[PDB]
């Protein structure tokens, strides 16, 4: 049976496992390594994808476009740190006008 299903995951454990060794990160990568990493990747994906989906609804749409990912990422204080020096193509900027104006 599938390593992705055995671990109760969506993200490809196998693929992640290939990338870990191909990458020449390690000499030999253990068994739980890709399953843990795959797990974290899926988690974060779900997280930003959730907040993004919310922003999509809040406007008026059903399809999530970059603007949503952007608005999503920038509004969560925690996610904003992680992707601090990241530029979302077609993400635009978070609406904001310095008070003093």
């Amino acid at each position: 049976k599938s390593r992705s299903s055995r671990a109760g995951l969506q993200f490809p454990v196998g693929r992640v496992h290939r990338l870990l060794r191909k990458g020449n990160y390690a000499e030999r990568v253990g068994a739980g390594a890709p399953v843990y990493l795959a797990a974290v990747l899926e988690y974060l994906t779900a997280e930003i994808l959730e907040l993004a989906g919310n922003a999509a609804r809040d406007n008026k749409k059903t399809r999530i476009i970059p603007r949503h990912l952007q608005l999503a990422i920038r509004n969560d204080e925690e996610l904003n740190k992680l992707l601090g020096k990241v530029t979302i193509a077609q993400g635009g900027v978070l609406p904001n006008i310095q008070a003093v104006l």
Binding site: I88, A89, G91, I97
Partner: protein, 78 residues
């Protein structure tokens, strides 16, 4: 040629930046920085190209160039 960038365009860019009033001098000043920014990025971008022996600068080259600049860009691969 950088003169092809335009007062409007820069004003819009400033507007998106939340800038209300714009001194007439920042238009040429901004052209200065945009050029320096592009030189630095395109230099490293072609260095990556000159490495795989490809005469064409792929979008992945601009990405690696930007990552080297400390500016990660999403939407063109990974």
């Amino acid at each position: 040629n950088i003169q092809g960038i335009t007062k409007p365009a820069i004003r819009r860019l400033a507007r998106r930046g939340g800038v209300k009033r714009i001194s007439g001098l920042i238009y040429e000043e901004t052209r200065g920085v945009l050029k320096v920014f592009l030189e630095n990025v395109i230099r490293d971008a072609v260095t990556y190209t000159e490495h795989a022996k490809r005469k064409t600068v792929t979008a992945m080259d601009v990405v690696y160039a930007l990552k080297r600049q400390e500016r990660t860009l999403y939407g063109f691969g990974g």
